[PDB]
Structures are given as structure tokens and as C-alpha cells.
A and B are shown apart, each in its own frame.
Chain A
């Protein structure tokens, strides 16, 4: 089951590049594209993400997209920049200027066909394509505007394939422009309809974690991306290595999505660690279980005690007592059963993988479909309404052909999403 990776825009390509850097090390692949590992566990399901060439060369099944060559040139000069298939570098020149309209309707529409030709070329090589995964931000123009355009056009040509996304949410604490709430709201509207799985990666949470927890006075996008690549590696573990639980994109969706619109997941991770700073003490299983469930470890700035878990997917990595894992996992549910909906029996599913990530003897990645995620969308909606009630900064969009009604619709659909999450919180 092959997965086609796509990364759009500045953010998408920077986390996307970091992602391929991390897992390539886990799969024993070097920047040259050659395998140099010791375990066969690394190569059993390496076909999910990597295409194999002659001489046993492994090339990422990745497509790099951007409306400006700035960020993508940095990738190509980066550490693993050479591993990527050069023909998969599809880019424009104009940029999107943090404008959703430009990325979705004008500037991006001019480039989207070139991308879909690459997607089609990869898909035809697949023995059994299971779906796609996208990495992008929702605050910009390209990754947000053109990203959602690609998703819509991919669904049209591959309507029976799973669409997954790693969507970075904007935050005033880490803000490029004032029009990010606009771009985000417009994008959420698209994600609710045309994705089966979306990992909500809040920049607010990534900042607070770096500041409050990791004690980084002034975190950079690099510090933020250490957390993302760690999370991205974890949530895809069950897909990249032999396992029984959530081994493919579809089975994951069946177990995580009780209702089609409610498919926005809170990622969590433990132990939280900063770059460079190596920890010498390995966490006990009770510590991993306690931390990965704590709000301070969630990648989405939401309080899980303000909502209820519809479904949960956990994955412990490293060498540990799987019995102790089963016990601690059962202990959480039994101690805090109120925070798990009773009308979905056994909604928590745990898995274990022998291979830990780099730097850590053991770790645990959390994936939760909590109703408390609404706090994220409500936050975007408030920042959206604050400007939209005065029609502020709207001329950037109407100049690209957009009407005010399209904003009102996007606003209404996200407020609906909030109310739907609220419906199952009081069930």
C-alpha cells in the first residue's frame, strides 16, 4: 500500500523536508538514497513511502510544491535535499503573498495542473495506492490556498482514495500577517469536506510548549519544527513498520472517525524534548502514559478536560513491557472514564513498535479525536469575526475575484463544525 506525499508552501516544505529527514534515518536511508541499517524491520514496509530504483536506491514518493522557488531551493540544498526526485520539484515564481485567493483561484490555478501530472505519474507506479498525505500551513496563501485546491482536484480524480493532511494552524503568538484567520477559516471549510484525516498542529501549542515547558525564551520555526517532525514520525509509525493496528490510512480512518466531518485529531507526544539537549534518563511507562495525555503535551492548544474523547490511537515505541503498557493504558481509562464517551465501547486502541526514534530510548505518540478541538476552531472564528465585522483587509481577496458571501459561508460552516463537536460533548 503506497502513500503519495505532497508538501505545499514555505511551512509545508520545511516540515515536509524535516519529516523525510527524520524517518529516512529511522529507515536507515542516507542522503544518497542508499540503505545502511542493521534491522530488517526497517525495510519490510519501506515501500509505503519510498519508491525503489535500480541498485536498491530508495527515493521518497514525495511531491514538492510552492508558488515561489525560495523555500524549495533551501530544501534542495538542505541535508537530505538530494534524495528527492528532481522532477517532483514543481514551482512557480509569483508567490501568493499570504493570500488564500491567490493560491486557490488565480496564481495557484495556473500551476495546479502541472502538479497533478506529477501526482498521476507517481500513482501509476503504485501497486495499490491507499491515499495521499499533505503537509502545509493554513495561514499562508500557497499551502493554504493552493493546498486545498489540490486536495479538491485530487479527490475528483481519486475519489476512492484516502486524503490525509498535516495542517499547521496559525496563531498570534507566531504570526506572519493579520490575514491568517481569513486564510485558515477558508481552508478549514475545505478540509471538513475533502479530507478523511487531519492532524491539527497548532503553532500556539508548539510555542507554549517551547516557552513554558522546554524553557526556550525565544523559540524559532526550527524549534517548533523539532516538535512537528517528532510527532509526524510517531503518528506514521504504524504505517511505516509491521503492525496489526491502524496499519493503513483507511483502517485508521474507520477507527478514528465516527462521523465524517469530525476527523480533526489532536496529536500528542512524550517525552517533550528540545533540540540538542539530550536526556539521559529513560521515562517509565507510567510516566509516558501520564505525560502523553497531559494538556502540556498536546500539539493542539486545547484542554482535553473541556471535552470528551470520541476515539484515541496510541503508539508506544522502544523496548518495554507490553503488559505494563496494557495496564497503564487501562488505568487511564478507568481513572478518567468520564472523559471518554460511553457510547463508543473500547474507543482507545494501543500499539507497540520495537524501534524507538533517534535520541530517545522510548517514547509515546498520542492521536485523539476529542470534542475539545472546538476550542481551536472557536479561537480562529473569533479572530475571523473581529476583522470581518468591519470587512477589514478584505480588499486583498476581492481584488482576486472573491465575494463577501464566500467568507460568510466559510464562517458559517466552521461554526457548524463547532456546534457538531458540542453535540457529542453532552451526549
Chain B
């Protein structure tokens, strides 16, 4: 019913119609997560080469 904020221009026009009213981690921590996971890869690869060495 109620049209408001009607703005017009050459390109077009915009407006709002209301029908009814109502009723972060740091760079440190990131680098710590990535490197920690890198160690877990290194440990896993080391255990493999240790196992293969046997």
C-alpha cells in the first residue's frame, strides 16, 4: 500500500512498499593452525619411513 523512498534516474528507479508494520582469529593463530597440521603430516610420514626402514 504505502510506497516510500521513491528515487528516480535515467537508468531506472527504486522504491520500498510496506504492506504491514512489524509486531575473528589473528594472523598468529592462523599460522599456528596451518603449521600444527604440517607437523602432523611430518610425523605421519616419519612413522612410515621408520616402518619401511624396519
Interface residues, chain A, CB within 8 Å of chain B?
152, 155-156, 159-160
B36 close to chain A: CB less than 8 A: no
**A-B pairs with the 3 shortest C-beta distances?**
A156-B52, A159-B48, A159-B45
Q: Which of B48, B49, B52 has the most CB of A within 10 A?
A: B52
Query: How many interface contacts (CB-CB < 8 Å) are there between A and B?
Result: 9
Distance of A152 Cα from B53 Cα, bound (Å): 10
Chain B residues lying within 8 Å of A156, measured Cβ to Cβ, are 49, 52
A-B pairs with beta carbons under 8 Å apart, 9 shown: A152-B52, A155-B48, A155-B52, A156-B49, A156-B52, A159-B45, A159-B48, A159-B49, A160-B45
Distance of A159 Cα from B53 Cα, bound (Å): 13
Chain B residue with the shortest CB-CB distance to A193: B51
Chain A residues lying within 8 Å of B49, measured Cβ to Cβ, are 156, 159
Chain B residue with the shortest CB-CB distance to A156: B52
Shortest distance from the beta carbon of A353 to any chain B beta carbon, whole Å: 35
Distance of A162 Cα from B29 Cα, bound (Å): 33
Bitwise interface map of B from 11 to 54 toward A, beta carbon under 8 Å scored 1, else 0: 00000000000000000000000000000000001001100100
Shortest distance from the beta carbon of B44 to any chain A beta carbon, whole Å: 10
- Bin chain B's interface residue count: under 10
Distance of A79 Cα from B52 Cα, bound (Å): 40
Shortest distance from the beta carbon of A305 to any chain B beta carbon, whole Å: 38
Given contacts A152-B52, A156-B52, A159-B48, 6 further A-B contacts (CB under 8 A): A155-B48, A155-B52, A156-B49, A159-B45, A159-B49, A160-B45
Chain B residues lying within 8 Å of A159, measured Cβ to Cβ, are 45, 48-49
Chain A residue with the shortest CB-CB distance to B53: A156
Chain B residues lying within 8 Å of A155, measured Cβ to Cβ, are 48, 52
Shortest distance from the beta carbon of B5 to any chain A beta carbon, whole Å: 47
Chain A residues lying within 8 Å of B45, measured Cβ to Cβ, are 159-160
Distance of A160 Cα from B45 Cα, bound (Å): 9
Shortest distance from the beta carbon of B43 to any chain A beta carbon, whole Å: 13
Distance of A155 Cα from B48 Cα, bound (Å): 9
Chain A residues lying within 8 Å of B52, measured Cβ to Cβ, are 152, 155-156
Distance of A95 Cα from B49 Cα, bound (Å): 30
Shortest distance from the beta carbon of B50 to any chain A beta carbon, whole Å: 11
Distance of A61 Cα from B49 Cα, bound (Å): 27
Distance of A205 Cα from B52 Cα, bound (Å): 34
Distance of A156 Cα from B53 Cα, bound (Å): 9
Shortest distance from the beta carbon of A175 to any chain B beta carbon, whole Å: 33
Distance of A155 Cα from B51 Cα, bound (Å): 12
Distance of A86 Cα from B2 Cα, bound (Å): 86
Distance of A155 Cα from B45 Cα, bound (Å): 11
Chain B residue with the shortest CB-CB distance to A153: B52
Chain B residue with the shortest CB-CB distance to A152: B52
Distance of A159 Cα from B49 Cα, bound (Å): 9
Distance of A260 Cα from B27 Cα, bound (Å): 35
Distance of A159 Cα from B41 Cα, bound (Å): 12
Chain A residues lying within 8 Å of B48, measured Cβ to Cβ, are 155, 159
Distance of A160 Cα from B48 Cα, bound (Å): 11
Distance of A156 Cα from B51 Cα, bound (Å): 10
Shortest distance from the beta carbon of A247 to any chain B beta carbon, whole Å: 25
Shortest distance from the beta carbon of A162 to any chain B beta carbon, whole Å: 15
Distance of A156 Cα from B45 Cα, bound (Å): 10
Distance of A180 Cα from B19 Cα, bound (Å): 83
